[PDB]
Design a protein around this ligand. Sequence first.
Ligand SMILES: [Zn+2]
Length: 289
Amino acid sequence: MLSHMVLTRQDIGRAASYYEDGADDYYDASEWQGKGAEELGLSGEVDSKRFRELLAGNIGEGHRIMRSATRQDSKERIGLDLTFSAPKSVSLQALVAGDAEIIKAHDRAVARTLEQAEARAQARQKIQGKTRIETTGNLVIGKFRHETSRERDPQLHTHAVILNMTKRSDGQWRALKNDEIVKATRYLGAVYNAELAHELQKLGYQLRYGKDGNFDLAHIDRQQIEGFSKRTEQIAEWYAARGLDPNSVSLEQKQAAKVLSRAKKTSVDREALRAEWQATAKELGIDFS
DNA sequence: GCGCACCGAAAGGTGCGTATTGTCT
Ligand SMILES: [Zn+2]
């Protein structure tokens, strides 16, 4: 699954806390990606300090803060979060059964997808009143891999935070024209899927493909999957309480179901959580081969 | 965005809207 969220000033708090579900993780969880990142000397582990600066449009070398041209009647844009989420059975196999190669499978599929997102990076340039749209082919991306859902289910996902910055052909840094990435969300989600399937196939898993063109590991069925999808069950209950058909809900109804069905939830011992997953998978009769 | 009005300083740049699957920031 691939979703996007345009990030603004009010989101700067959560964007920078994409470190938080990661210290207890149990697996290089932060990583820079992008030609733009390379250009800026950014490599490997994401530095929290510099991420904040970049979020704030401070390239900090010699140059001025980006995005002054942002109107005051409108929201400043700090980046673009592309959140890649594995199918449940995949998280299960990676995080309960403990298969590290699946983590790498996931990471590669994200990295490869992001490169295709990067080919789509654009900026504007106005010359003498004439505006041109330029493909810059470069993004600055801080990637934050996470392992758990808001209900503490195994949930392998990565937040690819695209900074609102790109380097034009004339060497000038500009806000990203995000159109081609945003409107390509579904196309990018299918690239993540294809690359992930391919990776899992090389590890020797068999894939069962579904209705939607999504897939799960062949040996883990739907009931097993649902026993580890608590948020899905809470959303389903929201709908049913309101007597809504999931097939035709409006955006407002969908967003309400997702946001308002959430419980207020603590942190927890991760050694203890893992053991709980494993006991839970036994209860559900899961054979991880 | 379907070229605009308002940003700061460049006869220039920005958000705006964009999206829409499930495993469910
Ligand atoms: Zn997360």
